[PDB]
Design a protein around this nucleic acid. Structure first.
Lengths: 156, 202, 226
RNA sequence: GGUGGUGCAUGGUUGUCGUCAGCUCGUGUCGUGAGAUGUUGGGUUAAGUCCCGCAACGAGCGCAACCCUUAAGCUUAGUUG
RNA sequence: CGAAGGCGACUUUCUGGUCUGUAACUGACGCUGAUGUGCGAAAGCGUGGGGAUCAAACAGGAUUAGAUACCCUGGUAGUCCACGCCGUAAACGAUGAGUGCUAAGUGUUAGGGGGUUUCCGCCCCUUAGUGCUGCAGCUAACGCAUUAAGCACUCCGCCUGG
RNA sequence: UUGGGCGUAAAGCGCGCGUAGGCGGUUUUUUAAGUCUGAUGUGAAAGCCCACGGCUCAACCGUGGAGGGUCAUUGGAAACU
């Protein structure tokens, strides 16, 4: 259970003897759209091949998002290093509420109710970091309310 | 790039000699009768893209020995072109009756005369990658001995060729009886010379 | 089977370790104390949690998970190797080239490489394999079969191991953690408790530790297999 | 038909880094990236060729006593030698 | 150790203060920050020395196919100490100063508790530090970290284009 | 604040030493003065909810309620002050 989506590519061309190759180092999200958005990366070479040769490396480890469906009821955000985003929860009856690069990964996990305060640094590789920070550090509601000694709603 | 032009690679095991010539008299005219006739079929065979050189003069009963195994151009239908040369190439050689031809088995595997098969893959310069140069990707990995590929035929006016590499590896890389040859042809650079240096690897 | 006997566990050298300040606050859950430096196992989960490691391997070997009993210490280059063999496996008595499993997938080929170069030295036509070849084949053989043994003939993977000093021999465990496999281990002091799911500061001098646990785990992949 | 001029229009013609003994390459694989394997730390023969210890395993590229040549037989024999 | 620039002959001083073992004790009585505190090294700096050394200048020499220069004694001052300092150094921590930790480790100056006392030494606890690494954290990485280039409570100033 | 940091990068002081201060550790306890006023008369246009009419649609205009649910007016009382 993960999510299918293309992330990006990159043409590496190093200072070398002969002609500089342009390996299309690509990151891809793969799966069948449950809520647990699992992306990965890959260093792959051929123009039509490097999508799959890089998804090869992407699916080696594709991450879990324990997703409070409908919407994460409270403010949902995260951070690592220079990367972070923010999501204020809004009504789900609003259409798609998203930012610039996070638009299609907003559709990946099925919430489509919170907005995307597009914060973070200007770093493209760690743009992925800023994105995934928001939804990698999550924990469900009822399991936390259980974990805290009280019931699911004694703490509400 | 300060390179000389080779012909023979490792001659003594792999490289051989097809000298079967007996036209002993008239080294000024009978020699002409079998060498100047080689200046003839460059145009007619319609992008021949042929294997190798196997010349042979059968004891001066010369039947012309150049195969160019793409059929139809040299066959006809049951002795049309061959029997026609039986009367026409009496000016080429003495008799020249029923000139022969072979079948070409992956002609891009032949080290020497593949250069035509790839000079007719990018000289068009119009859809010069798929319609014509499909065969660089077809004739890749039949395990030829000399593994070296380059193309330089009128790509923007290029005066040199191309190469592709990556890096790793271990081997005892010394081998002394391989086979490979040259390639050089007649494209027009219009300001500074480059006859296209063109090979592929099978 | 499950547990070790208690005497050669205790007195014949499991609890002993090394001097303090080669200190493991991270293995404090199994470290009892130290005798002028030399550490001591908490001497109860060295057997109780050893039975829980047996149960961890019980439903692992009841489906075909045979643990590699590894050669790291000097009795392990022979006897823990040997109970790996009793389990139905081979041993590891040579060294990594420095990242074979963290840089996994090119000289992760060494699994097939030992499956092939050994079997080609073994199969027929060894005479046809000339002496010019046999020189390097036999110069490499002493390094080859000792290189990898866990997936040698039990060509599935072990769901655990039995390490001693993963402080260095996490070159196997931590590099294989790319491959997402749990590990049990009879560890030494100031070594890893994290990568190994079951650590006990077991000094290697108690061969009861390697027989009545690790060869007993060669037996737990028979009883804890059936 | 040019010798009147342009190699410079291109076949070329070809001198030429440079015998560089070197140039390498895949399966690939690590470095978040600007960076990482071969042909090895101890000791051995005509062409980047290794073991106890090093990230390696798999092919080419210029080039085996390569087929002559000097030879030991012959072989073939008296033909002309 | 000092407010720093910095702090070096030693008998001594105040041993001021660090300093750890004791800390014998009234009840927020402090860091940074209006006050105000002082200086800050030399180049240079307001008197005898000072050309005594060193020393620019000059001499005088010349490389090999090139000086008066690398070369400098006589020597210009200057150098320098008994009466006046600037507010400048890579004074750099490129990293401001209070409450406390970040797995922690680490051998150790000081001062202690000591066992063993040794033959003034082996072992344990120890902190201002001392270093070393090393957990978390840190930034792009440089690389920092139980003593920051982290972590939660104090102030300061800086600047969000240059 | 909400929605910047300052080693290198936008930026962290030769320096330290200092008064007001900012903040320095608090452990108890009383007031109702403030820490989503009670409820209402209660609310600026291109601007607090709906109804409207005309707008060639529009272009653009205006209308009523809601008058608010937004100030005043009445309150006293924790576990900070």
């Amino acid at each position: 259970e993960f999510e299918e989506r293309v992330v990006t590519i990159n043409r590496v061309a190093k200072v070398v003897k002969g002609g500089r190759r342009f390996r299309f180092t690509a990151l891809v999200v793969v799966g069948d759209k449950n809520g647990r958005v699992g992306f990965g990366t890959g260093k792959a070479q051929e123009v039509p091949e490097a999508i799959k040769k890089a998804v090869e490396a992407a699916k080696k480890d594709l991450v879990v998002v324990p997703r409070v469906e409908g919407t994460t009821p409270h403010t949902i955000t995260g951070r690592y290093g220079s990367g972070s985003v923010f999501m204020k929860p809004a009504a789900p009856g609003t259409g798609v509420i998203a930012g610039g690069p996070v638009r299609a990964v907003l559709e990946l996990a099925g919430i489509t109710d919170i907005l995307s305060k597009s914060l973070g640094s200007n770093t493209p590789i760690n743009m992925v970091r800023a994105t995934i920070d928001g939804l990698q550090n999550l924990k469900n509601a009822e399991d936390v309310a259980k974990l805290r000694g009280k019931t699911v709603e004694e703490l509400y | 790039g300060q390179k000389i032009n080779p012909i023979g690679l490792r001659v003594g095991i792999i490289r051989d000699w097809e000298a079967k010539w007996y036209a002993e008299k008239d080294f000024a005219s009978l020699l002409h009768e079998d060498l100047k006739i080689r200046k003839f079929i460059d145009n007619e065979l319609k992008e021949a893209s042929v294997s190798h050189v196997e010349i042979e003069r059968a004891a001066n009963r010369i039947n012309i020995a150049i195969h160019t195994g793409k059929p139809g151009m040299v066959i006809g239908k049951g002795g049309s072109e061959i029997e026609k040369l039986r009367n026409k190439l009496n000016a080429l050689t003495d008799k020249k009756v029923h000139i022969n031809v072979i079948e070409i088995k992956k002609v891009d595997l032949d080290a020497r005369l593949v250069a035509e098969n790839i000079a007719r893959q990018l000289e068009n310069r119009a859809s010069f990658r798929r319609v014509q140069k499909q065969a660089i990707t077809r004739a890749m990995k039949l395990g030829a001995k000399g593994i070296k590929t380059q193309v330089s035929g009128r790509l923007g006016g290029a005066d040199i060729a191309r190469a592709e590499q990556y890096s790793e590896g271990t081997v005892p890389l010394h081998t002394l009886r391989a086979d490979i040859d040259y390639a050089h042809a007649e494209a027009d650079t219009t300001y500074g010379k480059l006859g296209v240096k063109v090979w592929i690897y099978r | 089977m499950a547990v070790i006997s208690m005497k050669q566990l205790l007195e014949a050298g499991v609890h002993f370790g090394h001097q303090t300040r080669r200190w493991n606050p991270k293995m404090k859950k199994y470290i009892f104390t130290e005798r002028n430096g030399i550490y001591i196992i908490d001497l109860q989960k060295t057997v109780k949690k050893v039975d829980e490691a047996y149960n961890f391997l019980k439903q692992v070997s009841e489906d075909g998970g045979q643990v590699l009993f590894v050669g790291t210490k000097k009795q392990a280059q022979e006897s823990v190797k040997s109970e790996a063999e009793r389990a139905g496996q081979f041993y590891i008595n040579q060294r990594w080239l420095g990242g074979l499993l963290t840089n996994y997938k090119t000289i992760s080929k060494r699994i097939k490489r030992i499956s092939e170069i050994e079997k080609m030295e073994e199969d027929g036509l060894f005479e046809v394999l000339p002496k010019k070849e046999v020189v390097e084949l036999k110069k490499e053989y002493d390094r080859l079969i000792k290189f990898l043994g866990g997936i040698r003939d039990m060509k599935s993977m072990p769901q655990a191991l039995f390490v001693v000093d993963p402080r260095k021999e996490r070159n196997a465990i931590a590099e294989a953690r790319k491959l997402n496999i749990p590990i049990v281990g009879i560890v030494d002091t100031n070594c890893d408790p994290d990568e190994i799911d079951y650590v006990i500061p077991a000094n290697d001098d108690a061969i009861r530790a390697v027989k009545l646990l690790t060869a007993k785990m060669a037996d737990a992949i028979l009883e804890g297999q059936q």
